Amino acid sequence: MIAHLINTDIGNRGVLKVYLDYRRKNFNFLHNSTKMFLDNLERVLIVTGFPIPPMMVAETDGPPGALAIYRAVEMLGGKAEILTYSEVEKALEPFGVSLARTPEPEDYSLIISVETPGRAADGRYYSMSALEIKRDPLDGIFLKARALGIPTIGVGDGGNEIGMGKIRELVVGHVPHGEKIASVVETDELIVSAVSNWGAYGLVAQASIEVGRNLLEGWDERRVIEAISSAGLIDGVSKTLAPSVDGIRLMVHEGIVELLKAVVDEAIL
Site string for Mg ion, 144-183 (x = CB under 5 A): -------------xx-------------------------
Site string for Mg ion, 203-222 (x = CB under 5 A): --------------------
Distances in Å between the Cα of 14 and the Cα atoms of 19, 25, 118, 122, 267 are 9, 17, 18, 22, 31
| Interaction site with a second copy (CB under 8 A) | 1-5, 7-9, 11, 16-17, 20-21, 23-24, 27, 194, 248-249, 251-252, 254-256, 258-259, 261-263, 265-267, 269
Among 246, 253, 256, 264, binds Mg ion (CB under 5 A): 246
Is 89 annotated in a binding site? The answer is yes
Nearer to a second copy, 1 or 99 (CB): 1
d(CA 203, CA 230): 26
Q: DSSP secondary-structure letter at 107?
A: G
Tell me how far, at minimum, the Cβ of 55 lies from a second copy, in Å: 25
Tell me how far, at minimum, the Cβ of 19 lies from a second copy, in Å: 8
> What does 215 interact with, of a second copy, Mg ion, none (CB < 5 to 8 A by kind)?
none
Nearer to a second copy, 223 or 249 (CB): 249
**C-beta of residue 196 within 8 angstroms of C-beta of residue 114:** yes
Is 188 annotated in a binding site? The answer is no
- Beta strands (DSSP E) in the chain are 43-48, 51-52, 57-58, 79-83, 110-114, 152-156, 189-192, 244-245, 248-249
Tell me how far, at minimum, the Cβ of 97 lies from a second copy, in Å: 29
Which range, of 8-16, 55-63, 104-112, 252-260, touches Mg ion by CB under 5 A? 55-63
Count Cβ atoms below 10 Å from residue 217 Cβ, excluding itself.
11
Nearer to a second copy, 183 or 208 (CB): 208
Q: Which residues contact 198 (CB under 8 A, 6 or more apart)?
A: 5, 6, 7, 8, 65, 157, 253, 256
Kindly provide the b/e burial profile for residues 106-123, where b requires at least 16 CB atoms within 10 angstroms of the residue's own CB: eebebbbbbbbbbbbeee
Question: Gaps after which residues in the chain, C–N over 2.5 Å?
Answer: none
- Beta strands (DSSP E) in 62-159 are 79-83, 110-114, 152-156
Q: Which residues are annotated as a binding site for Mg(2+)?
A: 61, 115, 157, 161, 246
Contacts with Mg ion by CB under 5 A lie at 61, 157-158, 246
Q: Which residues are annotated as a binding site?
A: 21, 31, 59, 61, 89, 115, 157, 161, 174, 189, 210, 246-247, 266
